[PDB]
Design an enzyme around this catalytic site. Structure first.
Site, PDB file in Angstrom:
ATOM      1  N   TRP A 197      -3.825  32.233   9.968  1.00  0.00           N
ATOM      2  CA  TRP A 197      -4.955  32.909  10.607  1.00  0.00           C
ATOM      3  C   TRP A 197      -4.915  33.084  12.114  1.00  0.00           C
ATOM      4  CZ3 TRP A 197      -7.238  29.871  14.331  1.00  0.00           C
ATOM      5  CH2 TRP A 197      -6.802  28.535  14.368  1.00  0.00           C
TER       6      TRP A 197
ATOM      7  N   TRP B  51     -20.747  38.871  19.093  1.00  0.00           N
ATOM      8  CA  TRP B  51     -20.782  37.530  18.582  1.00  0.00           C
ATOM      9  C   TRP B  51     -21.753  36.628  19.347  1.00  0.00           C
ATOM     10  CZ3 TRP B  51     -17.340  35.157  14.813  1.00  0.00           C
ATOM     11  CH2 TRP B  51     -16.496  36.094  14.177  1.00  0.00           C
TER      12      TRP B  51
ATOM     13  N   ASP C 165      -7.537  33.825  18.955  1.00  0.00           N
ATOM     14  CA  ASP C 165      -8.034  32.959  17.911  1.00  0.00           C
ATOM     15  C   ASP C 165      -7.895  31.466  18.300  1.00  0.00           C
ATOM     16  OD1 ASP C 165      -8.674  35.023  16.120  1.00  0.00           O
ATOM     17  OD2 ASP C 165      -6.489  35.150  15.609  1.00  0.00           O
TER      18      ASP C 165
ATOM     19  N   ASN D  54      -9.911  38.198  10.000  1.00  0.00           N
ATOM     20  CA  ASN D  54      -8.699  38.099   9.199  1.00  0.00           C
ATOM     21  C   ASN D  54      -7.962  39.434   9.369  1.00  0.00           C
ATOM     22  OD1 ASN D  54      -6.697  37.240   7.017  1.00  0.00           O
ATOM     23  ND2 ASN D  54      -8.037  35.445   7.202  1.00  0.00           N
TER      24      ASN D  54
ATOM     25  N   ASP E  27     -17.347  32.278   7.359  1.00  0.00           N
ATOM     26  CA  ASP E  27     -16.650  31.264   6.621  1.00  0.00           C
ATOM     27  C   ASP E  27     -17.532  30.136   6.097  1.00  0.00           C
ATOM     28  OD1 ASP E  27     -14.345  32.640   6.723  1.00  0.00           O
ATOM     29  OD2 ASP E  27     -13.583  31.635   8.547  1.00  0.00           O
TER      30      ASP E  27
ATOM     31  N   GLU F 214      -9.227  39.197  21.732  1.00  0.00           N
ATOM     32  CA  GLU F 214      -9.746  37.847  22.037  1.00  0.00           C
ATOM     33  C   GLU F 214      -8.956  36.837  21.211  1.00  0.00           C
ATOM     34  OE1 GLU F 214     -14.063  37.693  21.457  1.00  0.00           O
ATOM     35  OE2 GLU F 214     -14.378  39.106  23.095  1.00  0.00           O
TER      36      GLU F 214
ATOM     37  N   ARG G 112     -20.372  23.481  11.974  1.00  0.00           N
ATOM     38  CA  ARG G 112     -19.668  24.745  11.791  1.00  0.00           C
ATOM     39  C   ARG G 112     -18.199  24.560  11.453  1.00  0.00           C
ATOM     40  NH1 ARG G 112     -20.314  28.901  16.869  1.00  0.00           N
ATOM     41  NH2 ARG G 112     -18.306  27.913  17.451  1.00  0.00           N
ATOM     42  N   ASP G 113     -17.697  25.354  10.469  1.00  0.00           N
ATOM     43  CA  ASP G 113     -16.309  25.246  10.042  1.00  0.00           C
ATOM     44  C   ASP G 113     -15.959  23.801   9.677  1.00  0.00           C
ATOM     45  OD1 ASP G 113     -15.273  28.000  10.514  1.00  0.00           O
ATOM     46  OD2 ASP G 113     -16.027  27.615  12.530  1.00  0.00           O
TER      47      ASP G 113
ATOM     48  N   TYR H 106     -23.744  33.058  14.304  1.00  0.00           N
ATOM     49  CA  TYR H 106     -22.694  32.066  14.066  1.00  0.00           C
ATOM     50  C   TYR H 106     -22.893  30.803  14.892  1.00  0.00           C
ATOM     51  CZ  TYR H 106     -17.660  30.513  14.001  1.00  0.00           C
ATOM     52  OH  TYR H 106     -16.466  29.825  13.913  1.00  0.00           O
TER      53      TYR H 106
ATOM     54  N   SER I  99     -22.346  33.388  19.355  1.00  0.00           N
ATOM     55  CA  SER I  99     -21.674  32.162  18.912  1.00  0.00           C
ATOM     56  C   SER I  99     -22.269  30.871  19.426  1.00  0.00           C
ATOM     57  CB  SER I  99     -20.179  32.253  19.237  1.00  0.00           C
ATOM     58  OG  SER I  99     -19.623  33.472  18.702  1.00  0.00           O
TER      59      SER I  99
ATOM     60  N   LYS J 161     -14.412  40.991  14.412  1.00  0.00           N
ATOM     61  CA  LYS J 161     -13.702  40.242  15.451  1.00  0.00           C
ATOM     62  C   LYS J 161     -13.230  41.203  16.523  1.00  0.00           C
ATOM     63  CE  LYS J 161     -10.684  37.567  17.449  1.00  0.00           C
ATOM     64  NZ  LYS J 161     -10.876  36.169  18.003  1.00  0.00           N
TER      65      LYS J 161
ATOM     66  N   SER K 267     -17.952  19.907  13.856  1.00  0.00           N
ATOM     67  CA  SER K 267     -18.415  21.269  14.183  1.00  0.00           C
ATOM     68  C   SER K 267     -17.477  21.947  15.192  1.00  0.00           C
ATOM     69  CB  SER K 267     -19.795  21.206  14.835  1.00  0.00           C
ATOM     70  OG  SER K 267     -20.316  22.507  15.043  1.00  0.00           O
TER      71      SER K 267
ATOM     72  N   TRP L 254      -9.068  33.524   0.285  1.00  0.00           N
ATOM     73  CA  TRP L 254      -9.767  32.257   0.153  1.00  0.00           C
ATOM     74  C   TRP L 254     -10.550  32.207  -1.156  1.00  0.00           C
ATOM     75  CZ3 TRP L 254     -12.256  29.942   5.162  1.00  0.00           C
ATOM     76  CH2 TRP L 254     -12.731  28.655   4.932  1.00  0.00           C
TER      77      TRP L 254
END
Lengths: 345, 345
Positions: free
Chosen positions: B280, B50, B314, B220, B137, B312, B89-90, B84, B52, B308, B96, B184
Site C-alpha cells: 500500500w 481530508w 503514504d 489504494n 478502512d 501526498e 484509528r486503523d 476520518y 483527518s 486520496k 490509533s 481486503w
C-alpha cells in the site's frame, strides 16, 4: 540558581502508560529482569511532555494535574514541557513536519492558537514549576539550512520563537532554548554562529526577556560524558554533550548571554551504531541513558533529563518495523530497556 | 437519485496549490506536455478534502467557500469530504493512527469535538451538496482485525461510526461508508462478514438512519475495470473495483441494505507495481486514474472519484525519497502525471 536543584522531574503519564505494553511484552517471554526495568521507568523516571500540536495543548492540563497529585503525596516536582509547533517546522525536510505552515497564516496561528493558550495554562498554574524546551532543532536549521524553504522560514521563525519567549516570562517558568546537539552545532565553525542566532532571537523577544539557558541532544543519542567518543567526532571540540555545553557557554558568556544547559539522555547510542554523526531516525543499537539528575559534574549543565520519550518512533526509518513519527514502537522500547543504564532496575 | 448526477466533484484547493510545485518542475525541464497535464488536474479534476483531525475541521469551511464560489460562476458542485478521526484509528497497526484514543476518553471527544462540529458546518450549508466518505478502512479493521487491540476497540468503534451516521442525516448530505478495497474484503469468505458489519453499524445509527452506500479503493491502486487483473487476484471474485462493487451490492441487496458505490481512481497501479495485493505505501509505478465521472458502466457505482490526493505521501516507504504520511512527494506526483489516464492532457 538552577531550577532543578532539589526537585524531581515529573513522570510523563502518557509515556508511562505506553510503556505498559513493553512491560507486558517482557512478561510474555518470562523476562522478569527487563519487565521490572520497564516498571521502574514507568514509576520513577521523569520525562518531558511534548506539546507537538494544538490538540496536545490538553496534555499541559494533564501534566499540571500530575504535578499537583505528586506534590500532594509529598514530592517536589518540576514539569518538563516541549513547545514544538513552529510554522514550517523542521524546514530541512522541505515542508512543515507539523500542522502549521508559513504560507497558511502559520505565524499568526502559532502565536494565537498555540503560544497564547500554552502560556495561559502555565500562568494559571502558579503553584507549579515548569521547565520549557523551546522548539527543538529550529536553531540548527537556521544556522546551517541553505535550502530556499529554510531560507524563507528563517525570519518568521525567529519572530515566532522570540514571541514565545516574550509570552513565557514568569518566576515559575524556566526556559531552555534548544540548540540541537554537539554533532550539528558543536563544531569549531558553528559555535559562534549558534551564539549569534541566540542573540538575534533574544533581541526579538524584548529588552527584559530572559531565558535560563539551552537544551541539547533532544531526540539524539550522544553520550553526556565519555573518554571514548566515536571516531566521527574527530576534529570536533564538542565530542560529548558535557563538552558541547561548555563550548556554547563559553561563546555565550563573551556576548553576555545565558550559559546553562539541560541535556537529554533518554536514548544513548552504543559504540558503532552510527557511521555518520548526523544519523537521527530510530538509531540502533541504543539504550536508555542516565535518568534525571542534578549531579552533572559540569557547572553549566543544570541537569541531565529525559526529553524524547524513548519508544516513540522518530518516523518510518532507522530500525525496521518503525511506525510514523510519534507512534509507539514497542520493539524499540524493548531494545532501549535491554541496553538500559545501570540506574534502571 | 445518484447525488453526483449532473454535478462536478469540487476541486480541492489545497491539493491544487501543492501541484503547482509539480507543474513548475515539469516546466523547468522544458516538459510542456506534462506541465499542461498538471494544470488540467489543478483546475478540472475534483478531489476530496481530508478532515483527518480536529484542527482540519477548518478545511470544511474552506471547501464550503470554494463550493459557493463555484456555484457563483454557474457551476454545480458536489463537495467530497473524508470524515476520518475514529478513536483507535486503523487499529490493526496497534495504536490509533490519529489523535483520538479510546483509553483517553476518545469516544466522547470524537462525538463532541469532531462529529458535532462537522455536522454543524454541513447542516448550516444547506445550499451545498456533500458527499461524505465515512472512516476509511474502519470496517476492514473490524472484519479482519483479530488482535487484542482491535478486538478491544470494536464495540466503541461501531458506536462511533453509528453516531457519525446519526448526526449527518440531511437531504444535501450523502453518506458513503468506507469498505476498504477488493483485495481486503472482496474475497468470497469476506463479502458477507463485510455486509454483517454494515448491518450492525446501521442498526446502531438507528432505524431512520440511512447511508447512500459505500466507498472503495480510497488510497489504494486497484483498477476500476479490467479484463487483465494482476495474478495475485486469482481466486478472488472481486479482481477489480467494478466487480467488487457489484459483489458487495449483491450481498447488501439480499439483506435489504444500500448498494451504491463511489470508487477512488486517484492512483492506479500499472503492470507489475505490486507482487502482493496488500502492498500500500507509495506504490510504483502508478498513474493518475480516470478523473471524476458518473459514466461508470455499472448500476451499483454512482461515480468514479478521486479521494486520496496523489502526490501526498503514504509514509516514508515504498519509493525512494518518500516523506512522512501526508507530506508532498513531488517525484511521485511527476510519476503519476507522466503515467496519467488518457483524459488528462
Amino acid at each position: 540558581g538552577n531550577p532543578f536543584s532539589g526537585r524531581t522531574l515529573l513522570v510523563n503519564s502518557d509515556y508511562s502508560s505506553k510503556l505498559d505494553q513493553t512491560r507486558q511484552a517482557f512478561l510474555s517471554r518470562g523476562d522478569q529482569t527487563n519487565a521490572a526495568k520497564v516498571k521502574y521507568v514507568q514509576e520513577k523516571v521523569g520525562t518531558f511532555y511534548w506539546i507537538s500540536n494544538i490538540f496536545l495543548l490538553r496534555d499541559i492540563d494533564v501534566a499540571i494535574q500530575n504535578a499537583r497529585a505528586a506534590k500532594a503525596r509529598g514530592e517536589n516536582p518540576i514539569v518538563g514541557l516541549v513547545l514544538y509547533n513552529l510554522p514550517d517546522r523542521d524546514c530541512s525536510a522541505g515542508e512543515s513536519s507539523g500542522e502549521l505552515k508559513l504560507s497558511q497564516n502559520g505565524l499568526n496561528r502559532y502565536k494565537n492558537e498555540y503560544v497564547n493558550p500554552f502560556a495561559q495554562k502555565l500562568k494559571a498554574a502558579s503553584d507549579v514549576q515548569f521547565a520549557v524546551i523551546l522548539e527543538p532543532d529550529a536553531i540548527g536549521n537556521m544556522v546551517t539550512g541553505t535550502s530556499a524553504f529554510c531560507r524563507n522560514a528563517r525570519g518568521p521563525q525567529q519572530e515566532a520563537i522570540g514571541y514565545a519567549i516574550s509570552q513565557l516570562q514568569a518566576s515559575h517558568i524556566h526556559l531552555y532554548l534548544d540548540v540541537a546537539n554537539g554533532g550539528w552545532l558543536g563544531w569549531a565553525d558553528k559555535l559562534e554562529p549558534t551564539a549569534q542566532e541566540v542573540a538575534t532571537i533574544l533581541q526579538k523577544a524584548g529588552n527584559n526577556a530572559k531565558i535560563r539557558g539551552f537544551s541539547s541532544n533532544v531526540s539524539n543519542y550522544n553520550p553526556y560524558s565519555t573518554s571514548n567518543p566515536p571516531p566521527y567526532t574527530s576534529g570536533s571540540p564538542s565530542p560529548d554533550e558535557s563538552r558541547y555545553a561548555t563550548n556554547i557557554a563559553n561563546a555565550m558568556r563573551q556576548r553576555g548571554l545565558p550559559t546553562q544547559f539541560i541535556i537529554d539522555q533518554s536514548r544513548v547510542a552504543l559504540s558503532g551504531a552510527r557511521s555518520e554523526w548526523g544519523q537521527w531516525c530510530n538509531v540502533n543499537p541504543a539504550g536508555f541513558g542516565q535518568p534525571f539528575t542534578t549531579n552533572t559534574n559540569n557547572p553549566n549543565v543544570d541537569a541531565i533529563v529525559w526529553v524524547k520519550p524513548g519508544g516513540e518512533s522518530d518516523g518510518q526509518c532507522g530500525m525496521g518495523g518503525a511506525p510514523a513519527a510519534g507512534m509507539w514502537f514497542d520493539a524499540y522500547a524493548q531494545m532501549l530497556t535491554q541496553n538500559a543504564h545501570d540506574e534502571i532496575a
